[PDB]
Structures are given as C-alpha cells and as structure tokens.
Write a protein that binds this ligand. Structure first.
Ligand SMILES: C[C@H](CCCC(C)(C)O)[C@H]1CC[C@@H]2/C(=C\C=C3C[C@@H](O)C[C@H](O)C3)CCC[C@@]21C
Length: 254
C-alpha cells in the first residue's frame, strides 16, 4: 500500500499561510527583548526562599511571556479557519493554549549546545537557573528541558513546526469550548495537511511515524500546562507578585 497523496493546492495554501503567519510573529533576532524590564541575575547558588524573596527574573520573563502571548494571538488569527469561530471560543482556545504554544515556539531559541534558550548573547541567554529565579521549581523546569531536547531531535521542518502550533491551538478538547465540531473540523484540516506533508516531504527514511511522535509532544504539552498552572498559583501567592507580572499574563493565567 504505502500511499503517498499529493498535497492539495489548498493544503499548500495552508502551509504558505502558516509559514508567513509565523515569520510575521516570530522575530528570529529577538530585537525587541531590550525593551522588556531588565534581566536581574543575583545568584542563589543552590534557594526557594531567596528565589521567592527576590523573584529577580520575573519582571523580565513575564514581559517575555506577555509579549509572546501577543504574538501567539497574532499567529492564531491567521490560522485558516480560526476567524470562523465565535470570539468566545477564540478566547477560550487562546487562553488555554498560550503557555503550550510559548513552549513550542521557544523551541526555536533553544539550543543543544548548552541546553539553553539563546536569545542571546549573555543577557538574553536563559538557563535553568533563570527559571528558578523567576520562582518556578524543578518539577516544571526539568520536564521542560526534556521536552525541548525531544522536540529538537525531531528536526522538524519549519512547515511541521508551524503546523504543530496551529494544531495545538485549534483543539476541540479544551475545557469550556462551545462549538467543538467546528474546532475539530478546523483541526482535522490541519492534521491532514500535516500527515500528508510528512509522507510527501519528509526524508528520513521509512517513517510517516514522525506524525505519531508529534502528537506525543501535544500530549506532553498538556502535562507541562497542568504543572505550569500549579506553579503559577504558587507564584501568585507571593505578596506584590502582581507588580512583577503584566495585565495580560494575570488575565491569561489568573
Ligand atoms: C515556564 C516559562 C514561562 C512561564 C513563566 C511564568 C509566566 C512566570 O510562569 C518558560 C517557557 C519557556 C520560556 C523561555 C523562553 C521562551 C521564549 C523565548 C523565545 O524563543 C521567544 C519565545 O516566544 C518565548 C526560557 C525561560 C523560561 C520560559 C519563559
């Protein structure tokens, strides 16, 4: 059997639209980052109390996340079909997917040279110790780095990378969606574009089985999101935490 259908004119269009959507909303130069409140890295050596006391990298990482949520919304608006949903569902989907899409999309600055996100030079190079200094614990960070490496190693084409983001976002099992059929319809259209792409275009050899691995990463993103939730709740109990966040971050993770 081994059937290999040609991508349809429409599928191609979808891929074009998504590549362009991404390039419009992902500055590979990180040129805006000098506009965020400053990275502050005063050493905890090995401490939760200090890290909560200071939260030194929270202003900087929360501006980075607030900014990225903005670009995500932007990206989501150009996904073919997104606009056909009601704004009520559009927002439900943006809200519940934001943290996951940031994680996926942060794969583009992630480097296996030293397991960091290099945005970068020194000041915009983010390591595990920076994430701890923004008040997160190892139970989110370590599965996150593992997630970044797993994803890197999939060596996705940009096409697969932007399809995966679109699919993560337009998900019919988000708690609180109204019109699940429509969202599924939009997702199936992307998944099918992705499944076909992989068979049409992906080396590697012998596998259309990369599709399976991609879906596994979506499941992974679910767990990281739950863990992020619980660590965000905790963060939010630090007095004056709200000042170190932004309106958009509070509303999206509230
Ligand atoms: C868990 C957190 C986020 C949540 C932090 C709060 C809100 C306090 O809970 C991490 C996810 C990955 C991210 C990192 C980079 C991300 C990039 C850099 C660029 O790729 C451009 C992307 O759009 C975005 C590394 C540092 C840690 C992070 C911020």
């Amino acid at each position: 059997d081994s059937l290999r259908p040609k991508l349809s004119e429409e599928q191609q269009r979808i891929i074009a639209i998504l590549l362009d959507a991404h390039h419009k909303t992902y500055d590979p130069t990180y040129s805006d980052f000098c506009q965020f409140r400053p990275p502050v890295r005063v050493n905890d050596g090995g401490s939760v109390t200090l890290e909560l006391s200071q939260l030194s990298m929270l202003p900087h990482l929360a501006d980075l996340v607030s900014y990225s949520i903005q670009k995500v919304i932007g990206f989501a608006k150009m996904i073919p079909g997104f606009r056909d949903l009601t704004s009520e569902d559009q927002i439900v989907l943006l809200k519940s997917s934001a943290i996951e899409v940031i994680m996926l999309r942060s794969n583009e600055s992630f480097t296996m040279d030293d397991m960091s996100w290099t945005c970068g030079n020194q000041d915009y190079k983010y390591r595990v110790s920076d994430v701890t200094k923004a008040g997160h614990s190892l139970e989110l960070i370590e599965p996150l780095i593992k997630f970044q490496v797993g994803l890197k190693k999939l060596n996705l084409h940009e096409e697969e990378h932007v399809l995966l983001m679109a699919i993560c976002i337009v998900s019919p099992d988000r708690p609180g969606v109204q019109d699940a059929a429509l969202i599924e319809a939009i997702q199936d259209r992307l998944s099918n574009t992705l499944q076909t792409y992989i068979r049409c275009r992906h080396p590697p050899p012998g596998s259309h089985l990369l599709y399976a691995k991609m879906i596994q990463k979506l499941a992974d993103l679910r767990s990281l999101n739950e863990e992020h939730s619980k660590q965000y709740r905790c963060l939010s109990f630090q007095p004056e935490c709200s000042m170190k966040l932004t309106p958009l971050v509070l509303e999206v993770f509230g």
